[PDB]
Ligand binder design. Sequence first.
Ligand SMILES: NC(=O)C1=CN([C@@H]2O[C@H](COP(=O)(O)OP(=O)(O)OC[C@H]3O[C@@H](n4cnc5c(N)ncnc54)[C@H](OP(=O)(O)O)[C@@H]3O)[C@@H](O)[C@H]2O)C=CC1
Ligand SMILES: NC(=O)C1=CN([C@@H]2O[C@H](COP(=O)(O)OP(=O)(O)OC[C@H]3O[C@@H](n4cnc5c(N)ncnc54)[C@H](OP(=O)(O)O)[C@@H]3O)[C@@H](O)[C@H]2O)C=CC1
Ligand SMILES: C#CCN(Cc1ccc2[nH]c(N)nc(=O)c2c1)c1ccc(C(=O)N[C@H](CCC(=O)O)C(=O)O)cc1
Ligand SMILES: C#CCN(Cc1ccc2[nH]c(N)nc(=O)c2c1)c1ccc(C(=O)N[C@H](CCC(=O)O)C(=O)O)cc1
Ligand SMILES: CN(Cc1cnc2nc(N)nc(N)c2n1)c1ccc(C(=O)N[C@@H](CCC(=O)O)C(=O)O)cc1
Ligand SMILES: CN(Cc1cnc2nc(N)nc(N)c2n1)c1ccc(C(=O)N[C@@H](CCC(=O)O)C(=O)O)cc1
Ligand SMILES: O=c1ccn([C@H]2C[C@H](O)[C@@H](COP(=O)(O)O)O2)c(=O)[nH]1
Ligand SMILES: O=c1ccn([C@H]2C[C@H](O)[C@@H](COP(=O)(O)O)O2)c(=O)[nH]1
Lengths: 508, 510
Amino acid sequence: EKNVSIVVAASVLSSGIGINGQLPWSISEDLKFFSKITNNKCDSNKKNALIMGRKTWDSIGRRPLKNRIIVVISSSLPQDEADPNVVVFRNLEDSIENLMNDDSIENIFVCGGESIYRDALKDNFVDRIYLTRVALEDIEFDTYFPEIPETFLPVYMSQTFCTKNISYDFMIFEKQEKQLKSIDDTVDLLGEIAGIRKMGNRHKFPKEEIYNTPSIRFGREHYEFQYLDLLSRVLENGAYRENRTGISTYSIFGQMMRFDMRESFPLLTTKKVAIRSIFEELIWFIKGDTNGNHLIEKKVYIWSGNGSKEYLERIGLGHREENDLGPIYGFQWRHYNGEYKTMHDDYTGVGVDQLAKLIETLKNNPKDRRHILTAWNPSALSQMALPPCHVLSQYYVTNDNCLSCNLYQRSCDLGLGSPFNIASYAILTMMLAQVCGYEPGELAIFIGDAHIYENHLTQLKEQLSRTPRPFPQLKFKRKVENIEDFKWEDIELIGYYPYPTIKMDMAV
Amino acid sequence: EKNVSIVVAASVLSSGIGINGQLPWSISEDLKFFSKITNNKCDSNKKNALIMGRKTWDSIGRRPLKNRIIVVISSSLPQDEADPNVVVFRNLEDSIENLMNDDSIENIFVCGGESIYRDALKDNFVDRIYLTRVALEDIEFDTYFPEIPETFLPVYMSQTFCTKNISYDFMIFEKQEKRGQLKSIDDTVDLLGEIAGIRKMGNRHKFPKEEIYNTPSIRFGREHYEFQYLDLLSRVLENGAYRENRTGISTYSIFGQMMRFDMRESFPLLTTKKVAIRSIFEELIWFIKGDTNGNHLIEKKVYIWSGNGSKEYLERIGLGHREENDLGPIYGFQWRHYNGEYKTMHDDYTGVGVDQLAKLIETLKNNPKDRRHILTAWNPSALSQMALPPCHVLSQYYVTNDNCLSCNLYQRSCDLGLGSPFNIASYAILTMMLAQVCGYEPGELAIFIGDAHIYENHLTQLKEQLSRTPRPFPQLKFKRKVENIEDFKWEDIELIGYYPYPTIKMDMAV
Ligand SMILES: NC(=O)C1=CN([C@@H]2O[C@H](COP(=O)(O)OP(=O)(O)OC[C@H]3O[C@@H](n4cnc5c(N)ncnc54)[C@H](OP(=O)(O)O)[C@@H]3O)[C@@H](O)[C@H]2O)C=CC1
Ligand SMILES: NC(=O)C1=CN([C@@H]2O[C@H](COP(=O)(O)OP(=O)(O)OC[C@H]3O[C@@H](n4cnc5c(N)ncnc54)[C@H](OP(=O)(O)O)[C@@H]3O)[C@@H](O)[C@H]2O)C=CC1
Ligand SMILES: C#CCN(Cc1ccc2[nH]c(N)nc(=O)c2c1)c1ccc(C(=O)N[C@H](CCC(=O)O)C(=O)O)cc1
Ligand SMILES: C#CCN(Cc1ccc2[nH]c(N)nc(=O)c2c1)c1ccc(C(=O)N[C@H](CCC(=O)O)C(=O)O)cc1
Ligand SMILES: CN(Cc1cnc2nc(N)nc(N)c2n1)c1ccc(C(=O)N[C@@H](CCC(=O)O)C(=O)O)cc1
Ligand SMILES: CN(Cc1cnc2nc(N)nc(N)c2n1)c1ccc(C(=O)N[C@@H](CCC(=O)O)C(=O)O)cc1
Ligand SMILES: O=c1ccn([C@H]2C[C@H](O)[C@@H](COP(=O)(O)O)O2)c(=O)[nH]1
Ligand SMILES: O=c1ccn([C@H]2C[C@H](O)[C@@H](COP(=O)(O)O)O2)c(=O)[nH]1
């Protein structure tokens, strides 16, 4: 008995691990990771053994690895003797015996060639798989990682990283075989006694059947889990409620989500997200625009319904022309407190420009604590087609000169709105970072009424059955001078490989 | 081997457990807890044994406990085979002996009397201690739970509960003599951290080192909500970035963090330092009445808004033309007269500006499930006239299906050392007030911080605080049902069972 682990790097969609006797890419961090995992051991007078196939041997210059013993599988290679850090076997099965003996061998790693992976998995020799998911998928491959067998379950998944615009995961799987007992025994007995009265009961852990990729118990580091686990928590504990819209929701109050923005862009991968619409709705905010026709003109219908004659009629704004949403987001951002008459009037100079003051303060007085944008105007709400959901947002220049964002959101709808805000404020923050001279840092979203519309239950349950994939990267093709000059065309999505788009109808 | 646990309920400060042959209180959740912990077992063919002194056995009426075996330590009581569910032993040590005897015995509980506890601990018989800390002192006790020996560390502390206004609290201590979920995941996350450094968000949120983490041996059971404040503290202490600011005094800062606090079973007043509760109530209702006159506070001997309401400060910021302690359209002006025109702190502003606190109340009452119960103080039009731009910037309220009122607050900037304890207490109280007035019960308070920072002239004070294990939170009850939210008065408030550590002096950053 001694541990056997595969170590592989494979393309996210098709497990492409090689082309023309070489890799499909060069990613140093991955070689570094390979170096750390294969070198790692306790008793420092033993060596780990790296098993590989002759073509892979061939592939790295037949040049030995520091501090490790290579084991080449070949029919032809002479079992040499020049070198003791490189040994040769005629088949994979006998190459083990590694186990039995060489007590000078702590761990065994299967380092691949397809033919070798395929044999290790078929003859059931491997216990763990360390898999580096690489997000590049329209390139030639002639070598694949075989399908992970059912006996294996994912138990870790890291955040997404970036190298020269390529996103990658790493990820661990364990061959399955079948804190205190006291602390949990206590917490449960107090839970039985107290019922609703113990706050832990009001915040129950989600059940396996509604928790995305359940085997991943202690390694939920991919920040997309921050979104999916939120979904589970409400699936789990949400109270059923009626609301102004016909359609009722499951709801809980006071939640939060966090996303890295240094290494990747947080566009959900568990459903294809309408990034264009998101972007297009953002510059419309930025420009201070409240004319819904401008979005519709670019073929973005997200605000259609809240600007229809009937909807505005139903809510007291029947005096408005179709699509005059009144002083909603964009207007409070550039014209805070301005007096709104119609989308046709000229507002240049009226009201506080928050957004301009934001940029000025952000470049001139970075460490100061007042970088705030707010849409919550008690005096305007009744003229808005909808009061805002994303209500207030605070911005933060780190000592190392990234820009982070906090968004307070009164009423994210988890199914539709939420994945939008995530992307939206990510971008707003990247935009502010170009314009002000910083790099993107972190995004934290604080939620008030976090809920799911009931007509989304099955759809979101579908989403919850899909294991997340590395986030993509998002780059600007040019440096702008004023932030209102950004255009869709400027924007580059690198490496977005989502699952099918999931249809969800918006409750009006 | 075979577990021996002490189970005891004791007063938080002096460890009182008994007076005149009885308990100094009557708290049935505790008897429920006792019963659960002592009945709990795997093998339906074995039983647990509870050990007690004769006088304790007298205490419970000499009747057996369902489903368990009582073992009475007495010199004199007869060893009579009548009850198979009660056996007498002449000494604790022999009774311990349950350990090899009675394969039929699964677990062992020392159920007390001071003399059985003292003996069990002195003779080192015992592995774990289940302790219910009862928050009333200043009453008569004649029996005590011994001081817990240094060989035990605490490993769990529950949230605070309430019964007939008495706060209480469950903890476990383990005899500890001679990350980790398994190796493979911590190793991999460690290796990744090394490859990536600052590039892996995990390295940006490093775990607090043991010497700065409050009560470190409690690692998987930091349930007491006091820990939400303390752990935040240790977190900026471990990752907080240095930065100079508008005050000569620099801060250590991180960005984006949160705290939850229950308000159904207790009042979230920090116990690890005596907190100026009066001054908090007096500012709070100052805000509710919509008042901006700094004098009204000083007149009630509350000096928190003095430094910011003085002649020099008002000068240095461009408000020289303002009467002393005219603070401007700060918090309560915006709550009552959002966007109204600020003349002076003397004008009458009846009917001016949007009255948010009124709309709030109307909305909680008539539209409980609506998502627009919102209180805001961030008014870009009015920042400059303000002695100080607001820190508790926005709050939301939420009526649960079982009629409790919850509050979320977004705080852009938060002095962990000084303002934060005020904010927790402040908004717990406001929420309790809003709840009474609207017909509901207190629910939960969540607090979202933008800039969470510790002032550098505070480090040693907060380090001191971090070395004190928290005690169960007190209760706060209103003595009468007010008709209007601005009628509340300090006199109307009762603070039951607040037992803090001594106050810790910290200088304000002007
Ligand atoms: N992305 C990643 O993580 C990795 C990718 N790769 C890529 O994979 C490709 C190489 O893989 P692959 O084409 O499978 O070649 P392999 O590395 O699997 O080597 C194949 C050779 O191994 C020997 N061998 C295999 N099975 C047996 C057996 N049953 N008995 C005796 N000898 C055996 C034979 O050598 P002989 O002919 O001498 O008999 C065979 O030709 C390259 O593109 C490489 O870059 C490789 C490792 C990792
Ligand atoms: N708050 C809590 O959780 C609890 C509180 N209590 C309270 O504590 C008080 C009772 O405790 P306490 O006064 O210490 O009495 P105990 O329950 O410890 O009983 C004392 C008796 O136990 C027997 N005993 C003790 N030591 C020996 C020995 N070494 N050899 C032989 N017999 C021994 C003796 O009985 P005999 O005289 O027959 O020889 C002695 O008088 C009451 O107020 C009770 O309500 C009790 C349990 C729990
Ligand atoms: C958040 C936010 C901004 N908003 C604004 C907005 C306005 C009123 C609202 N009203 C309600 N009840 N829920 C909302 O989420 C909501 C959102 C959004 C509105 C609709 C979609 C939407 O239907 N998105 C696509 C379909 C359109 C597309 O493909 O572009 C989807 O089905 O996912 C997204 C965001
Ligand atoms: C929040 C808020 C309102 N405010 C107003 C206010 C004004 C300027 C500020 N400036 C800075 N830098 N930090 C602050 O927290 C702060 C707070 C407070 C100011 C001081 C104390 C304070 O020193 N409190 C007691 C001591 C006095 C007492 O016992 O009453 C303490 O030490 O806890 C609390 C609140
Ligand atoms: C077998 N092989 C192909 C290869 C490439 N990438 C991989 N990536 C992963 N994740 N797993 C593999 N098995 C893997 N294999 C290898 C093996 C070692 C080195 C190598 O250079 N290793 C150095 C690491 C060099 C570095 O630090 O950059 C070492 O010290 O181990 C390169 C390719
Ligand atoms: C020994 N004693 C005094 C007493 C009271 N409170 C305590 N509380 C604690 N935590 N620990 C003790 N040892 C303890 N002891 C007792 C013990 C049992 C019962 C009792 O009635 N027990 C019933 C209680 C059942 C119930 O009320 O649910 C049981 O089934 O266990 C009362 C007093
Ligand atoms: O960024 C956004 C834009 C608005 N909405 C949704 C949330 C609610 O479903 C709806 C507002 O509902 P009420 O507060 O009006 O009831 O708008 C979002 O979730 N996110
Ligand atoms: O309710 C309040 C009143 C103000 N402050 C503190 C927070 C900051 O320490 C200080 C303002 O600092 P600057 O934003 O001026 O830098 O006031 C609070 O924390 N809470």
